[PDB]
């Protein structure tokens, strides 16, 4: 089995797994939609009661499985709980990252396309003033790129450039993954994460210099970091905070587990896992939190910035920020640096969420790495045409896999590892080889607080929010639901074939 070559490479690869589009695009929108500082108290508590403990649990499960030649949850769940229902539940550890990859890599390809166009200066020129006259050319730029519907049909028509850039993006992902763990993912992380950190710090510094008649970047930081204890009673904020914690740390994707399956059986995971988790949170709240929101607040004020965040999920990062930059000398190049930052953040995450399918084809069906990578890329590239051409298919996949799925799977993996496998056996496995020990209080958190916290979350979610999404959406949501359900059945069939191959061997 491949292993990570160095401790630093392991940490930077895991940090690149975590640090992605969720830090720089998702977190600012989630925080702004939910009152800024009102969002941060639940967010911090969720990190301490969910993020950290599940990170350690996923590192432990992966290292445990890797020592027996298994890096994905169908086999690992079965090692922890010899029961054919364990293999079936483990399919979600292939399905969730595959479904997320199907729309994550496409969004990633937008950042590359925008980076290219901004580098070469093929960008809108606002009029030499009214905010709408500045924002509209950049809204039109995005809408022409992804092909937003101009009539009533729920149909997208991406530009030829966007389609080609998606092929290029897929090719870049493949060229890293096909070289493997140490010579591919690890080597790239050592280059990408330093670059990513420098670009982000430079953009924060540039954004901190923004000042208009409507405010300063400081006004944005006060909005994000000022507690509002009245919102501690709103379940929606807690739901939003925990969902972001899952998404930003790659928890419930089966991806941390697969990466940790390449950690040597004796090697520490307590300190390594905490460091990767801590690096992501720094990149999230310090870097991601200090670029988009302060820039938007400085130019428009809190109320307009909040409304911009609510209007869309891509408004802030693809329309508003480049528009703001356009009003400053060298703003087109700053836009390039922003989208180049997003691309590297995205790329280091998309190789991580495609590796589980690769590891399954290698570990369980005994495919060569070459064939495993090429077939995985083929499945993602083909399936992505649904997200490219059907309006709101992206949203449907992000909900079932990237929102509900991750939380459900995090509770599932905790119950399997800490209740069924055994809390004391799980606790020993986490701490074995640790440079540090997990604090004893966290044994009680993992066994009792974390599962109850999530169970309550999922119940209030399913009762007071989800029904709207099962009765109000447009009929085309069933196209995406049908397809991703078919993907689950396809992956279940592959697990079945892996069973019969081991039976026959
Ligand atoms: C199925 C993939 C369709 O892809 C489409 O292909 C057309 C010709 O191939 C191009 O002109 C379009 O830009 C592209 O979106
Ligand atoms: C990486 C580079 C991507 C290839 C650039 C393709 C851009 O081609 C585009 O599509 C149409 C041409 O068929 C026309 O609109 C223009 O020629 C151009 O806008
Ligand atoms: C979910 C499945 C999505 C497949 C969408 C592929 C649609 C390709 O679209 C085709 O592109 C042509 C290029 O000449 C255009 O004339 C038309 O839009 C269509 O014929
Ligand atoms: C997934 C569905 C995406 C298919 C893209 C359809 O593309 C085109 O749509 C137009 C209808 O308005 C017509 O040009 C044709 O029916 C079709 O080729
Ligand atoms: C919520 C969980 C966050 C609490 C982590 C604080 C660590 O707490 C420390 O851990 C040590 C190891 O058990 C103990 O020996 C110390 O007495 C304890 O204060
Ligand atoms: Na993240
Ligand atoms: Na990343």
Residue numbers in the entry: 5 to 132, 135 to 511
The article reads:
LeuT, the bacterial homolog of hDAT, has provided key insights that have improved our understanding of Na+/substrate-coupled transport in the neurotransmitter sodium symporter (NSS) family. In the NSS superfamily, which includes DAT and LeuT, thermodynamic coupling of substrate and Na+ -co-transport occurs via an alternating access mechanism that comprises the opening and closing of the IC and EC gates. Previous studies of LeuT conformational dynamics have shown that the network of interactions between the N-terminus (residues R5, E6, W8), TM6/IL3 (Y265, Y268), TM8 (D369), and TM9 (R375) are key to occluding the IC vestibule in the outward-facing occluded (OO) state.
In all structures (superimposed), L-Ala, Na1, and Na2 (purple spheres) could be modeled into their respective binding sites (left). Na+ enhances the OF conformation poised to bind substrate (red trace). Consistent with previous findings, the spin label pair monitoring of the IC gate in LeuT WT showed a bimodal distribution between IF and IO conformations in the Apo state (black trace), whereas Na+ alone (red trace) begins, and Na+/Leu (blue trace) completes, biasing LeuT toward the IO conformer (right).
